[PDB]
Amino acid sequence: FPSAVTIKSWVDKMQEDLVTLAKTASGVHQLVDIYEKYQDLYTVEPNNARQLVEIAARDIEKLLSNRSKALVRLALEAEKVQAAHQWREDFASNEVVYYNAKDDLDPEKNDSEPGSQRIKPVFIDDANFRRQVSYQHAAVHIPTDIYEGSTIVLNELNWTSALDDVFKKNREEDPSLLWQVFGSATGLARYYPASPWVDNSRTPNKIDLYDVRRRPWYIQGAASPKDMLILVDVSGSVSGLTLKLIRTSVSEMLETLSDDDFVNVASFNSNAQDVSCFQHLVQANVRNKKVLKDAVNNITAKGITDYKKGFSFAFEQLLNYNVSRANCNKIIMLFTDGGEERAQEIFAKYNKDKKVRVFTFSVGQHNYDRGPIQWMACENKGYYYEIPSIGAIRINTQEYLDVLGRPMVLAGDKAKQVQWTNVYLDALELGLVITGTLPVFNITGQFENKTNLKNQLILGVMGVDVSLEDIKRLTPRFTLCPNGYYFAIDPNGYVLLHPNLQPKPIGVGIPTINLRKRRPNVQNPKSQEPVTLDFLDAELENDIKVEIRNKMIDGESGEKTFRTLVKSQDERYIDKGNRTYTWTPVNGTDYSLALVLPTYSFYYIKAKIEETITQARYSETLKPDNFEESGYTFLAPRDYCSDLKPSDNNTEFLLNFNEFIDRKTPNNPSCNTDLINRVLLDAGFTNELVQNYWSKQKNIKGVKARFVVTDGGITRVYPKEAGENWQENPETYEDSFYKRSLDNDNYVFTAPYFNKSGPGAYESGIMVSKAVEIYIQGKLLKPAVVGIKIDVNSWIENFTKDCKRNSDVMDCVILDDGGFLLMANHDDYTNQIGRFFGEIDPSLMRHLVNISVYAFNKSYDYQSVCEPGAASKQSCITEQTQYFFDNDSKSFSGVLDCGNCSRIFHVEKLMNTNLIFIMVESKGTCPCDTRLLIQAEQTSDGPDPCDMVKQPRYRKGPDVCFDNNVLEDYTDC
Amino acid sequence: MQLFGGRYDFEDTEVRRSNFDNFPQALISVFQVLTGEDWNSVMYNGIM
């Protein structure tokens, strides 16, 4: 076995070859100098990370205020218009003319329902809604199993007909406005502008199950948070149909809860116990509700019914005050069938003052006495519901919000505060939106104080959607390097704005589908939950990020500069980077906004090209025909002008951009002149590099391609025939290698993919990259990244020249930080180049982890697509692993004992790059193996929530709470 | 009322009106099995 000095000299020469090749063939110094030699076509401008955050916070506050002022118009108009309604019952003569959404647009139908008449709209096609929309009237949605033609529904379509002219006025005062909706307490949803629903019930086969009363914005604006305890009866009498109905009912009742509510499900039969692992009230988020549903669906019925034990258990659960709670609405929901005990002793002992409400549900078709259950309901300020079948579950389990809203109505204008929802997916396919809500009160006989009987409930909720791409435009990110970004936070941890928030739903557990128990044409329900992704689940989690999170949850302004681990774009690598977080509170609302900037991104370049000579010359440089002298060019599909749109076909977009820039000189009264000026200056610099330096040596020995990817949005590859193998995003802010090379101060080697259907191993090469680094007047700047595609064969033939092709005495490989094979020695390894080393020799990889040359970090991706297990694609959690270099040592000599065996190895880190050389005794010597070491998304189920509940993340609750009014009625049950 | 009393608790949603849950219903069931009408479905519920 070679000595340390021979191996050190081997890797010294081997790394000098690679580094010199890349340095002399990419052109880092030439580009640095042509960036520094001009110094007058641009100016270096500062990035004030406090001023930026304050300006963005003010724009967000202004947007949400403009949306709040359009809600207090609709609420006022709705209250005034309904107060003056007449309540006729004779419509078959004076019809109600309206547009029923989810009705077929065929002109040869002519429904003309009794008492109503239809509208056939024109449905122009609009932007800001990727669907056909009519600004002339409002559309109406009525749930499928609610007859349109009742006297309750026709009396709603009559007075709600006056909202249309306020919808129109709101839209014409601020044309940036998305959906405006009134959701009625009768099921109606009247929204503007008009647009056909996504699912007609039976016109196509797929039926729709959309009730406005179960939407998050409606429930959020209809009542204050709650401390629910669900008390389930699992005595013997409930076995059969009523136990199955109780299970479905408890699931549908849990689906009406949000993240500001707290819940626990208990169960009693001669003995009361928690039905799950929770033991107290938990936060009622998607994971906790998943646990509670899975625990409810395992209930079996046996024993004697003892209401006193269950109610003692419930009232003691609602008295903890040691755990985090909502502390607003203490309610008990008793799901039973019928009995003879009413337990007046327990109610007098426990809620003599009636601070806790009771809602009782009698489930099933049975012969038992219901009187005591209604008494429990009518006495403790609650209500009584009957669920005889599956069809009653939805409407009876969402109606308690009517009772909970009486104290909010009795507060008047103190209770009309706008609220903003979590992030969820618009039902009309607009992506991620938040909705501002406002509850509408019933005031008939208000200036003479007549009724106060039907006036204890709300009429509905008014809402207005705000898309996240409307907020992502008030935080422009194109003056920050690819690594800086804005992100906002709830007073709950959840994220309103993040690069790692996706339009997919949050997955819980591992999906499990049964194929032997699914009819073909049954129209399964899909989902209704919001996309609540915590801030600590979107990034990697230090203990400094936890304190930043908690520090900006309680509305504090601040700044912190530290050193953290950042995961790459393609989740394969991890980098140790310096970051600066600067956060502030959004004043009008309860959001907080932070900006993350890496130092080296405190200054940016601002173009100063205003000479038509140089501007036109630079614009000449990017036309496809002339590519053969400048190299294949890609342009970033940003929004340079409001006219041209990002086409996602980059030659399409490039020709559009060229004909736009020449068809209208750079005056462009309504374009974004700074972006186009940066693009032009950038293309000029890059073309100068390609002409003066790259074009001299048309071909180099080992090089396969030469690329420049820069800020501004210019990609250039020198041989056009290499431009056909470019797989990178044309937007330079998604290029993983760009953001990776910005962090490191050396050459970064990217590892290709393994078993990838396409040219990715030998036709393309191994990608080396390095960031351009200039000093203008004492200010660091990294405006571009140059690189190289290295030919695999040339590298092999320099590698072989104790390690010879297919030698069977020792293996000599080259990996990068991440454990991916880049240069093998066996023609069996080297065919799978770009594969994780723990998959072709797990023993040495595990030992390398043990001896502390590789470290690793594990994370959870909560929005993943997944193949359903055995118990097209569903949503699941995946566990991800990433390996990197922790110890900064250079050499590692040792021996691994497989048991009965031993293999000596030496590893040495090629300095000034991210590569490591390993020479180990051949695996063919010893017949040892333990198990593969996989680095890939493994569909997981953890973390275990029964443990997170005992140490939950910090969180602030709402402080407005409308319960416990003294002049309520509760003569209703 | 002893053999099949409170034992028709099948989880499915199909209604079985001729059961033995109380005394008037047991009387009705026994009389219907006496008249011979549909006694086989009463027997099948008793077997299941």
From Swiss-Prot, chain A:
Taxonomic lineage: Eukaryota, Metazoa, Chordata, Craniata, Vertebrata
Every Cache domain range: 420-511
Disulphide bond pairs: 378-961
Residue numbers on the Extracellular membrane side: 1-973
Record localization: Membrane; Cell membrane
Carbohydrate-modified residues: 66, 110, 158, 298, 322, 587, 755, 850
GO molecular function: calcium channel regulator activity; metal ion binding; voltage-gated calcium channel activity
Note: Binds gabapentin, an antiepileptic drug.
UniProt similarity note: Belongs to the calcium channel subunit alpha-2/delta family.
Complexes and interactors: Dimer formed of alpha-2-1 and delta-1 chains; disulfide-linked. Voltage-dependent calcium channels are multisubunit complexes, consisting of alpha-1 (CACNA1), alpha-2 (CACNA2D), beta (CACNB) and delta (CACNA2D) subunits in a 1:1:1:1 ratio.
PROSITE patterns per record: VWFA
Motif MIDAS-like motif mapped to chain: 233-237
Record's keyword annotation contains Phosphoprotein: yes
Any single Gene Ontology cellular-component annotation: T-tubule
Residues that coordinate or bind a divalent metal cation: 233, 235, 237
Annotated ranges, domain VWFA: 227-404
Gene (name only): CACNA2D1
Name of protein: Voltage-dependent calcium channel subunit alpha-2/delta-1
Modified residues (Phosphoserine): 93
Post-translational modification: Proteolytically processed into subunits alpha-2-1 and delta-1 that are disulfide-linked.
Domain notes: The MIDAS-like motif in the VWFA domain binds divalent metal cations and is required to promote trafficking of the alpha-1 (CACNA1) subunit to the plasma membrane by an integrin-like switch.
SUPFAM superfamilies: vWA-like
Topology with respect to the bilayer: Single-pass type I membrane protein
From Swiss-Prot, chain B:
Compartments it resides in: Cell membrane, Sarcolemma, T-tubule
Residues noted as binding Ca(2+) in the record, renumbered to the chain: 37
Locus of motif Selectivity filter of repeat II: 35-38
Source species, domain of life: Eukaryota
Signal peptide: none
Intramembrane parts of the chain: 25-46
Expression by tissue: Detected in skeletal muscle T-tubules (at protein level).
Membrane side Extracellular: residue ranges: 5-24
PTM statement from Swiss-Prot or TrEMBL: Phosphorylated. Phosphorylation by PKA activates the calcium channel. Both the minor and major forms are phosphorylated in vitro by PKA.
Record's comment describing the protein's domains: Each of the four internal repeats contains five hydrophobic transmembrane segments (S1, S2, S3, S5, S6) and one positively charged transmembrane segment (S4). S4 segments probably represent the voltage-sensor and are characterized by a series of positively charged amino acids at every third position. The loop between repeats II and III interacts with the ryanodine receptor, and is therefore important for calcium release from the endoplasmic reticulum necessary for muscle contraction.
Binding partners and assembly: Component of a calcium channel complex consisting of a pore-forming alpha subunit (CACNA1S) and the ancillary subunits CACNB1 or CACNB2, CACNG1 and CACNA2D1. The channel complex contains alpha, beta, gamma and delta subunits in a 1:1:1:1 ratio, i.e. it contains either CACNB1 or CACNB2. CACNA1S channel activity is modulated by the auxiliary subunits (CACNB1 or CACNB2, CACNG1 and CACNA2D1). Interacts with DYSF and JSRP1. Interacts with RYR1. Interacts with STAC, STAC2 and STAC3 (via their SH3 domains). Interaction with STAC3 promotes expression at the cell membrane.
Family: Belongs to the calcium channel alpha-1 subunit (TC 1.A.1.11) family. CACNA1S subfamily.
Function: Pore-forming, alpha-1S subunit of the voltage-gated calcium channel that gives rise to L-type calcium currents in skeletal muscle. Calcium channels containing the alpha-1S subunit play an important role in excitation-contraction coupling in skeletal muscle via their interaction with RYR1, which triggers Ca(2+) release from the sarcplasmic reticulum and ultimately results in muscle contraction. Long-lasting (L-type) calcium channels belong to the 'high-voltage activated' (HVA) group.
Protein name in UniProt: Voltage-dependent L-type calcium channel subunit alpha-1S
Shown residues in whole-protein numbering: 578 to 625 of 1873
